[PDB]
RNA sequence: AGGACCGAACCGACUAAUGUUGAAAAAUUAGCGGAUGACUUGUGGCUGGGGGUGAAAGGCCAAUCAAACCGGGAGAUAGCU
RNA sequence: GCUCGCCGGAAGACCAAGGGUUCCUGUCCAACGUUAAUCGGGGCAGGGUGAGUCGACCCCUAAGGCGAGGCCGAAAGGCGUAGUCGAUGGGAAACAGGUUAAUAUUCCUGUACUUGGUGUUACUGCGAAGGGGGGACGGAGAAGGCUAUGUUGGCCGGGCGACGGUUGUCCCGGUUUAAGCGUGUAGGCUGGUUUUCCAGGCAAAUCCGGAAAAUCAAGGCUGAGGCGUGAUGACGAGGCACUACGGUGCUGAAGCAACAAAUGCCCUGCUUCCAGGAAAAGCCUCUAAGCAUCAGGUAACAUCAAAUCGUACCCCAAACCGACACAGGUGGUCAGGUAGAGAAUACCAAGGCGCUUGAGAGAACUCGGGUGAAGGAACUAGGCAAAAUGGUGCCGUAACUUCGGGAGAAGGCACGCUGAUAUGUAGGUGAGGUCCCUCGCGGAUGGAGCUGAAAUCAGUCGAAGAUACCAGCUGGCUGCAACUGUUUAUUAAAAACACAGCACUGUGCAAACACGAAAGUGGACGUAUACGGUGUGACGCCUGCCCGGUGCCGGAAGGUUAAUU
RNA sequence: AAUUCCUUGUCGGGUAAGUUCCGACCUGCACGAAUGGCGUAAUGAUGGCCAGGCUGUCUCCACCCGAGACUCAGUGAAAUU
RNA sequence: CUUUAAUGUUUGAUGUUCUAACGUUGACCCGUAAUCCGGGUUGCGGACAGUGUCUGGUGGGUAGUUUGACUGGGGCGGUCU
């Protein structure tokens, strides 16, 4: 659910919460956890490659099955769980064979729902089948880009891919960005939309929240003594030059796709 | 419940006076701000010089920073004292 | 040595880091000590540090480091797999008393405990570089039950007062005792037991997990403290023999109860929230490869080993970092009494210092402070500074407002002491006794005793009763920024910087981007409700016209147009 | 007006008197709507202004308590030249 | 020798298809109790991508420098034969 707190304190006026009592009020399944230490935006060389990364509440990783390769074995859900590594929720499933796994939560899934992966699976939210068997004009998530590696597309809170056409060994899709892409007609795609749609409605209401997520403050650059930034400074707020990133790139229209390796799977890039 | 409140420890450093070859190569006394947090601290580790880092001041990087220190090219050049 | 003074949440006590003999004793006084110096953290000599249980080493691992191979790189060399290192973390074991001039839970006494090795006896399925369980973990809040500690009484011992009174409801001192062993309570978690079956736990599996039936509801685990033992002891205020008043032998009475009570223990818990909260090993189990009248494993006893290094002293300081015996800085633990909300603050105990130049005089003037005639900001850039305000409870509290606030608005009233209501009340605690029992650390009754507010009435003293330290000045208009916060260490705390939110734009994953000649890493073990960049800067009303120029995003006919030919 | 040169713009408010301050006027030398515009409760060791209260801030200083200064003994610098 | 079509060969361009180089930060197997690497099998792309040399454009992102003299101070103006 969604709820807007009371302005009993400054910084609580506009903060909005996404409360969902369906989540698990306890610890997750340890066998599916591992070590994940914060990075700080630095690399093997120690330099900060990406900025605005630092601190944040401690986090444990959830071993999520982005492949769903346990075909022909129904699995029932047990509980929904919070995952900080991603914006979407996850549900602790239980296969008939006694094995447990983590997956993404579809739009209207609940505890006790049955799911089956493979080609002989039913067409209902949560099941996984190759796209060669999915009806055209349907909705899917956790889509794969290559057979056998695991879903990569539509893994966000309320994101979904909509299958729109099929001609041969490939199937065309409309991604949440509006792009029109075509991928092999053998990749696995789960039905339904990832259910956390109300996540985009969450309001932090104060700066400290962005620190819990690990977002360090972002200084503009308009006043950045010119040695640091092309925007530089000047007596007052002059800013009389084009918008440019550091290292000299526009940032306000310059398209920077230099792949030229696919040239086949793009149809309607966007806009 | 709170980046809530009064207020010590604790972290700060707004003003004043003293001190200005000082007790101190930036402190002291009287008051002051914050004080469950974007807090603070210990131990160890990573980022190295046109580079690092920076809630950004051209600030910090061993009392030294509009480009650290050491040694070297080097007895640089110096139509200037 | 007798006094006075100072800290006493330290200016006391115990350590890490660091220092490295500054430790104790004797001797010495050139130099060092901001003076003298018989003294000294000074000089010379000598002595001093005792561990199976504390710590390190060691076992395991984190961020991270090196890195056989190997990938990459003009050379140097760089990253990194398997692995190996790396604490600030996890991992078996000792408490009290006594003792040295200087060392201790290290030595002595007493009482214990732990992990291994070997051997003996009996019963036996034992086994890993594997599997699983466990270890294993967040913040906040809430009480409840306890202890350390403290208070009073009782008891024991002594005392009868330099000056009125002091054989009493008087004064002083003491009333301490551990780990360990057994008891397994308050209370927390959890439904157990027996068998059959199974796509999973990389192979196997009696253990994990899963599934279907049967059967009893009490089963087990965790767990402070209390109680008993440990302890016919030890310690013990004081006495008694040696007694150089330097000290040693023996002896040594009472050693209970009640109340209060922690920020610590039960609690790695309970409750709740979103920011969703380390790893590996040891340990407990599972079997595989393999070995079985073996080896191995288990229970009991006997016995052996538990090495090596460190331990002195200072450690908020005169011994570390600051050139000084420098008003500085420096992490962790212990946390007494009265008043108090309190680790504030004031006076004190234990304990430790009086700050390594003193004396006299009592001028200007400076520094740090007290007070003030009448006036009360006229001083001044400016109420700078100083003064004043200051607490508890009740009454009361405006425009505005995002309806939370503003607000402790402003303002007003009473605060002491004695007695009584009540020989000390409400209330808390709770004994004996009585009764019950699944007979225990039980339950209920019971209300002793202890403890202890607040309120009113009356009376009383004083100039003044929140008498001291301690402890908000308030109100009105308005600019800027929303606010909390943040920055020029060492002249700039601000209207700048950040900020939640909004917007444009890029990015379809071998993502853009960034670091790197490269491999490759971060971004991210993320996937457009996402990441990066730019601008603006809560929120509310809004964000208007112009694409000529620059740049960007696009297109097509033609013209120009490189190497190459 | 944190922007207004002429300028102490005019009027009014408050003051015995107000180049600052508040409220309107608009003749914008030279505001302007995300290098954001107009407002904005609340916050503020923020900038400016007006009151109450209290004050040695002043009229105008006076006395007292201490530490130096001054005298005596001991150790014994400095910048400058 | 003045001329014009299917063909043989020549090469040149557009397009379709394929695989044998190449790629694979796709799956699986082995070295091997190893998310590296290598090899192997298979699958998807496929002469594209990518790299190298030459080359046009872009390029304050990063460097090395220049930015005159006279002058009733300099600058501005003005002048320089």
From Swiss-Prot:
One of its GO terms (cellular component) is cytosol. InterPro entries: NA-bd_OB-fold (IPR012340), Rib_uL2_dom2 (IPR014722), Ribosomal_uL2 (IPR002171), Ribosomal_uL2_bac/org-type (IPR005880), Ribosomal_uL2_C (IPR022669), Ribosomal_uL2_CS (IPR022671), Ribosomal_uL2_dom3 (IPR014726), Ribosomal_uL2_RNA-bd_dom (IPR022666). Residues 38-47 have a biased composition (Low complexity). Keywords: Acetylation, Ribonucleoprotein, Ribosomal protein, RNA-binding, rRNA-binding. One of its GO terms (biological process) is ribosomal large subunit assembly. The modification N6-acetyllysine is found at residue 241. One of its GO terms (molecular function) is RNA binding. Residues 27-52, 220-271 are annotated as: Disordered. NCBIfam families: rplB_bact. Belongs to the universal ribosomal protein uL2 family. Part of the 50S ribosomal subunit. Forms a bridge to the 30S subunit in the 70S ribosome, contacting the 16S rRNA. Interacts weakly with S6 in one of the 3.5 A resolved structures. In pull-down experiments interacts with CedA. One of the primary rRNA binding proteins. Located near the base of the L1 stalk, it is probably also mobile. Required for association of the 30S and 50S subunits to form the 70S ribosome, for tRNA binding and peptide bond formation. It has been suggested to have peptidyltransferase activity; this is highly controversial. This protein can be partially replaced in vivo by its H.marismortui (HmaL2) or human (L8, from the 60S cytoplasmic ribosome) homolog. This is Large ribosomal subunit protein uL2.
């Amino acid at each position: 659910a969604v709820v807007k707190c009371k302005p009993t304190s400054p910084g609580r006026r506009h903060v909005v919460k996404v409360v969902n009592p369906e989540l698990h009020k306890g610890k997750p399944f340890a066998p599916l956890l591992e070590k994940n230490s914060k990075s700080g935006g630095r690399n093997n060389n120690g330099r900060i490659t990406t900025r605005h990364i630092g601190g944040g509440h401690k986090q444990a990783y959830r071993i999520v099955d982005f492949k769903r390769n346990k075909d022909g074995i129904p699995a029932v859900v047990e509980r929904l769980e919070y995952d900080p590594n991603r914006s979407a929720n996850i549900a602790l499933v239980l296969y008939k064979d006694g094995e447990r796994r983590y997956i993404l939560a579809p739009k209207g899934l609940k505890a006790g729902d049955q799911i089956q992966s493979g080609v002989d699976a039913a067409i209902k939210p949560g099941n996984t089948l190759p796209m060669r068997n999915i009806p055209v004009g349907s909705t899917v998530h956790n889509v794969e880009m290559k057979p056998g590696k695991g879903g990569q597309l539509a893994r966000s809170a309320g994101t979904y891919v909509q299958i729109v056409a099929r001609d041969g060994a490939y199937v065309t899709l409309r991604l949440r960005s509006g792009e029109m892409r075509k991928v092999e007609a053998d990749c696995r795609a789960t039905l339904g939309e990832v259910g956390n749609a109300e996540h985009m409605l969450r309001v932090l209401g104060k700066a400290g929240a962005a620190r819990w997520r690990g977002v360090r403050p972002t200084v503009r650059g308009t006043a950045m003594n010119p040695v640091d930034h092309p925007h530089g400074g000047g007596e007052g707020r002059n800013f009389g030059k084009h918008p440019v990133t550091p290292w000299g790139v526009q940032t306000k229209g310059k398209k920077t796709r230099s792949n030229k390796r696919t040239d086949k799977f793009i149809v309607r890039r966007r806009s």
